Amino acid sequence: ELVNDTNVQFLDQDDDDDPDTELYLTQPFACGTAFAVSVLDSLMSATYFNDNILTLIRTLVTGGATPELEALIAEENALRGGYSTPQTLANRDRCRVAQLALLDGPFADLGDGGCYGDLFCKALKTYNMLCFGIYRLRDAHLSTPSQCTKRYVITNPPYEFELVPTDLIFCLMQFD
Amino acid sequence: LTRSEAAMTVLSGHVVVCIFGDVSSALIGLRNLVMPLRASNFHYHELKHIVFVGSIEYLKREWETLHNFPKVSILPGTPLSRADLRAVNINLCDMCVILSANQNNIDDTSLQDKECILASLNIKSMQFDTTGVNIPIITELVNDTNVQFLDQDDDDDPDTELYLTQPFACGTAFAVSVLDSLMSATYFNDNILTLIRTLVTGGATPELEALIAEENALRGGYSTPQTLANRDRCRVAQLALLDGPFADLGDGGCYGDLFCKALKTYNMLCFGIYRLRDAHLSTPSQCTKRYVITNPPYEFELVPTDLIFCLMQFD
Amino acid sequence: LESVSNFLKDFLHKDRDDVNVEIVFLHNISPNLELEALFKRHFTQVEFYQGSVLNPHDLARVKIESADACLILANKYCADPDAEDASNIMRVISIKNYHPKIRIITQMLQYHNKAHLLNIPSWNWKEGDDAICLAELKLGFIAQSCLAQGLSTMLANLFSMRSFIKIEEDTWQKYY
Amino acid sequence: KIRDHDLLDKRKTVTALKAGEDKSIRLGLFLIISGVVS
Incomplete structure (x- = not known):
């Protein structure tokens, strides 16, 4: 984390430093290795223009903390241990975030230059995964081989988008 | 005592005192609050149990001034933690007193009461196997303009004096600034402060405060007929017009008949009436809030939901 | 001059509709050096006022009975975090006392x-009232990234309003 | 180095009248007063 976001310059030796750039353009933030709190100032506007959006972020990020559960936490502070029941045991069927590699047999057949739209349809129809972003290797566009294991985040690639066997995909896997 | 030990104990009609204390904070002299509740006027089974809620490191300094008293207990904890005030059975208490030892370490003239105000809203927003909005509260204030935030259904206006504001007229707030008027009264009549002293402190005589000046602590005596005859003083109490002695007069009779009856029969000296805020309205309402009428003028009409202040005899 | 900056850049963004509602600001201490320049840069939609949010007199002149919402901002760089957010509760009390809805x-x-x-009797989150907890989201995004890297920078890009941009180059940032 | 810098986007109308309303009223008052004074 960073307290003052202009110090992001010093986290890497092979970027382009310029104090006038916004965090979202800078390499170590685009790679997901830095996170200043100031990027949450934008969340005010979104919460004004749509009330619903903050409730989604809440359920996606906190691990599904329901208004019912935070009432117990408000009253006792600590997390009170329960005794298991069928209704309790049925509660844990939620989805989880994970990332997956195009080197496993289920998808390696499509990972040598196939388009993202086929992978989305296949994964959703077969496993209910909902693939939603791709985490690319920084130098994979270059023909020259390189040792940078650094990556960057692509959100929602537009169907006819081409993928290579070194890419990782974000998805919302089911519980079982 | 711990929450478990307090939950095993049964408390009702007790007084809960919430203290926002700290290791550095000044002494507020809790001996002064306990002392009137220990007047020899009360029978031993009639004494209200007192429980303090606060940080133990504060109570350690006060407590060596008051360990001589009959029923006292401490729950180490924080007034804002609902589990602590659930453990001292707050829904059955007679009074919840909220105090801040802090009133000088922060000099913002605005944020001054913030911790103290939140404690009142927590208790009002509790719920039980009913809601907590009926529980008796009397909180103090450092800066009297913050009185606005104690209730949601008043009219807020910073130019009004405390004596007009609803939570002060109801007797749920008490800032120290109302005692600045006592200077004038003490100048124009010397006698008046001695009456307040005897009425409020529990009869502390110049003879007794000489022993306290010399030894600090309250020295235990051995009983004698002269000692035992000393405890015939009057006590404050309030009474309800639903008991058989006065219910016959509580459906619309005039206060002057009640005064004469009570004084002649029991020597009570009824002196004020504590009315239900909405009792003048024909429309029924859930406001259990009340306000104080001093010295109603004889031909004044009373209703069966009113409570009366009086100075009952000992026996 | 920093606290309003990340807000105004996104609230007055060009890629939203002609939602021209931003017309007010209110806090006791007078504006300073380039904060007045930032207000003059948006002369038509700022309209700052001196006045304290604890006076029902000041709230009455700001016409807060007519306002659609009241956005409350707090300094994450505070010397005692548990004092500021407690202070900030009674700002909510003062507003809800003057007007409950x-x-x-x-x-x-x-x-x-x-x-x-939840103690404030006229706070009802089912009507839209909500509290953005900085520690809850800050540690939440970081925690989520321990399952899949880059998920912090993924989510932090979904809330800020942002134009599409063309890059002719094949550099990594063209796809980003 | 410095990317595409920024974007040229702005859409304003002084609301309808503000500085023009103030100036035209002021001018009218100045002409009223200087008429009476003259």
């Missing part, structure tokens, strides 16, 4: 203090 959007520095908003 107004939307409150607010930010909280600690997590535990979020319970206090």
Whole structure:
């Protein structure tokens, strides 16, 4: 984390430093290795223009903390241990975030230059995964081989988008 | 005592005192609050149990001034933690007193009461196997303009004096600034402060405060007929017009008949009436809030939901 | 001059509709050096006022009975976080006393203090009132990234309003 | 180095009248007063 976001310059030796750039353009933030709190100032506007959006972020990020559960936490502070029941045991069927590699047999057949739209349809129809972003290797566009294991985040690639066997995909896997 | 030990104990009609204390904070002299509740006027089974809620490191300094008293207990904890005030059975208490030892370490003239105000809203927003909005509260204030935030259904206006504001007229707030008027009264009549002293402190005589000046602590005596005859003083109490002695007069009779009856029969000296805020309205309402009428003028009409202040005899 | 900056850049963004509602600001101490320049840069949609949010007199002149919402901002760089967010509760009390039906959007520095908003009898989150807890989201995004890297920078890009941009180059940032 | 810098986007109308309303009223008052004074 960073307290003052202009110090992001010093986290890497092979970027382009310029104090006038916004965090979202800078390499170590685009790679997901830095996170200043100031990027949450934008969340005010979104919460004004749509009330619903903050409730989604809440359920996606906190691990599904329901208004019912935070009432117990408000009253006792600590997390009170329960005794298991069928209704309790049925509660844990939620989805989880994970990332997956195009080197496993289920998808390696499509990972040598196939388009993202086929992978989305296949994964959703077969496993209910909902693939939603791709985490690319920084130098994979270059023909020259390189040792940078650094990556960057692509959100929602537009169907006819081409993928290579070194890419990782974000998805919302089911519980079982 | 711990929450478990307090939950095993049964408390009702007790007084809960919430203290926002700290290791550095000044002494507020809790001996002064306990002392009137220990007047020899009360029978031993009639004494209200007192429980303090606060940080133990504060109570350690006060407590060596008051360990001589009959029923006292401490729950180490924080007034804002609902589990602590659930453990001292707050829904059955007679009074919840909220105090801040802090009133000088922060000099913002605005944020001054913030911790103290939140404690009142927590208790009002509790719920039980009913809601907590009926529980008796009397909180103090450092800066009297913050009185606005104690209730949601008043009219807020910073130019009004405390004596007009609803939570002060109801007797749920008490800032120290109302005692600045006592200077004038003490100048124009010397006698008046001695009456307040005897009425409020529990009869502390110049003879007794000489022993306290010399030894600090309250020295235990051995009983004698002269000692035992000393405890015939009057006590404050309030009474309800639903008991058989006065219910016959509580459906619309005039206060002057009640005064004469009570004084002649029991020597009570009824002196004020504590009315239900909405009792003048024909429309029924859930406001259990009340306000104080001093010295109603004889031909004044009373209703069966009113409570009366009086100075009952000992026996 | 920094606290409003990340807000105004996104609230007055060009890629939203002609939602021309931004017309007010209110805090006791007078503006300073380039904060007045930033207000003059948006001369038509700022309209700052001196005045304290604890006076029902000041609230009455700001016409807060007519306002659609009240956005409350708090300094995450505070010397004592548990003092500021407690202070900030009574800002909510003052507003709800003057008018009960107004939307409150607010930010909280600690997590535990979020319970206090439920005590205020006219706070109802089902009508839109909500508290953005900075520690809850800040540690939440980081925690989520321990399952899949880059998920922090993924989510932080979904809330800020942002134009599509063309890059002719094949550099990594063209796809980003 | 410095990317595409920024974007040229702005859409304003002084609301309808503000500085023009103030100036035209002021000018009218100045002409009223200087008429009476003259």
